[PDB]
Ligand binder design. Structure first.
Ligand SMILES: Nc1ncnc2c1ncn2[C@@H]1O[C@H](CSCC[C@H](N)C(=O)O)[C@@H](O)[C@H]1O
Ligand SMILES: [Zn+2]
Ligand SMILES: [Zn+2]
Ligand SMILES: [Zn+2]
Lengths: 429, 9
């Protein structure tokens, strides 16, 4: 009921500020929970999940005024009103255009800065403390930031007309630099992207391709946990990137977006790069290309389109391109997720099983994305009466997620129940 | 896009 702060801000040798433990930490230990300073649904999910709680409830009611924001209840619509009142007229005026996520997010940020009532999200680090990397920014990035600025000014014109209507310390250009640099993709239960937010305190964490911490979201609520034994004074790290990336791809996105090159052992040794790019470049690069179109359809929840593209690609390469190739792998993943959202459970189990061994290799021992994946496969097996396999995978998912999601998490509750149902049928038959 | 975490299209 009164757990003490187990982490603290500190200055690193080279990585700027960071976060480190003040006490020894066990895997699964909760380090920090934070509400966002500000957050918003991402473009692809507007109208599919509740603007407030980010859950994908079946039937949503749109805000009468703007008909852009949608809510799962009067409760959520009311609770979100402080975050929505200053943007509503802006969204109405914008139609049929919709602003970029960063512009809508920042639009929420500026009013929260005036709050005056201390934000629990800024307990260790404020919005103004956030790194902007302005000195390191390329000219190409600065031009883009300038565009975001002008877009902001147009999008907000009904509510903000001059710099004097915002705090003086605030600077719009530097703000977008910070947003690009410090924002978090908010994922749901099934590890789907549903939103984006600023979590200034959490933003203290520096990057590693081999992190000692993981993050999982409870709606907009962010939970930070250790995923292995951490010593006193040891820097806490998370992974800014998708795990299914070559060391070259990671080096590029960390540079273009975060203005630094990673020096972790995985990046110094090109760890697992070979396996990732298994197969002939002439073959998998077509897949890599298609992946863009597919991921955009997935973001917009177009599962029928996603499935169509995937099984086309999948069947087309079955004779020459192995599942462990990360681009092929991603397609199998998308295919699986699509089948699940379309009730095609047997087909889902087919694609999902094929992701299992590659996921074990490419993901660390305890990673939330792997855990949830293993959970889905076990469930799909359970639904097909393949009890002993299901039992194996359900146990594994529990083993992982009790560390990544924590025991108190709702998915653990389902998991336990599934474990019982499954372990019964074993002794029974 | 942008944001710490999230898939890589
Ligand atoms: N592994 C790493 N090595 C060097 N710099 C890193 C790093 N991980 C993160 N950073 C730096 O930290 C930024 C991410 S926000 C992390 C906290 C920040 N360094 C601060 O002092 O407030 C990146 O833009 C990058 O400049
Ligand atoms: Zn809601
Ligand atoms: Zn509205
Ligand atoms: Zn690295």
């Amino acid at each position: 009921f009164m757990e003490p702060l187990k982490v603290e801000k500190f200055a690193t040798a080279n990585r700027g500020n960071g976060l480190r433990a003040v006490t020894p930490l066990r895997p699964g230990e909760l380090l920090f929970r934070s509400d966002p300073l500000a957050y918003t649904v991402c473009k692809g999910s507007r109208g599919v999940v509740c603007d407030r709680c980010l859950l994908g409830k079946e039937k949503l009611m749109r805000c009468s005024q703007c008909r852009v924001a949608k809510y799962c209840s009067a409760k959520c619509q009311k609770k979100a009103w402080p975050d929505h009142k200053r943007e509503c007229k802006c969204l109405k005026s914008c139609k049929p255009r919709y602003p970029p996520d960063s512009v809508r997010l920042l639009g929420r940020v500026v009013f929260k800065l005036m709050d005056g009532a201390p934000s629990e999200s800024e307990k260790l680090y404020s919005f103004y403390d956030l790194e902007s990397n302005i000195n390191k920014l390329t000219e190409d990035r600065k031009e883009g930031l300038r565009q975001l600025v002008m877009t902001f000014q147009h999008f907000m014109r009904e509510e903000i007309q001059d710099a004097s209507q915002l705090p003086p310390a605030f600077d719009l250009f530097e703000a977008f630099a910070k947003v690009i640099c410090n924002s978090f993709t908010i994922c749901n239960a099934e590890m789907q992207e549903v939103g984006v937010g600023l979590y200034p305190s959490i933003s203290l964490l520096n990057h590693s391709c081999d992190p000692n911490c993981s993050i999982v979201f409870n709606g907009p609520h962010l939970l930070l946990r250790a995923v292995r034994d951490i010593e006193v004074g040891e820097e806490l790290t998370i992974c800014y990137l998708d795990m299914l990336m070559t060391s070259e791809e990671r080096r590029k996105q960390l540079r273009d977006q975060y203005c630094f090159e990673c020096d972790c052992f995985r990046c110094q040794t090109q760890d697992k790069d070979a396996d990732m790019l298994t197969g002939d470049e002439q073959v998998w690069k077509e897949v890599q290309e298609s992946l863009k179109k597919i991921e955009e359809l997935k973001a917009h929840w177009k599962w029928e389109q996603v499935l169509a593209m995937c099984q086309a690609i999948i069947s087309s390469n079955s004779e020459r391109l192995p599942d462990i190739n990360i681009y092929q792998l991603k397609v199998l993943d998308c295919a699986m997720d699509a089948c699940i959202n379309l009730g095609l459970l047997e087909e889902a189990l087919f694609y999902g099983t094929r992701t299992m061994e590659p996921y074990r290799i490419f993901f660390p021992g305890s990673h939330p994305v792997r855990g949830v994946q293993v959970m889905k496969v076990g469930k799909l097996q359970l639904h097909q009466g393949m009890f002993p396999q299901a039992m194996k995978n359900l146990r594994l998912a529990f083993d992982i997620m009790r560390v990544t999601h924590g025991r108190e998490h709702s998915l653990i509750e389902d998991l336990i129940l599934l474990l019982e149902e499954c372990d019964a049928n074993i002794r029974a038959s | 896009k942008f944001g710490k975490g999230g898939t890589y299209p």
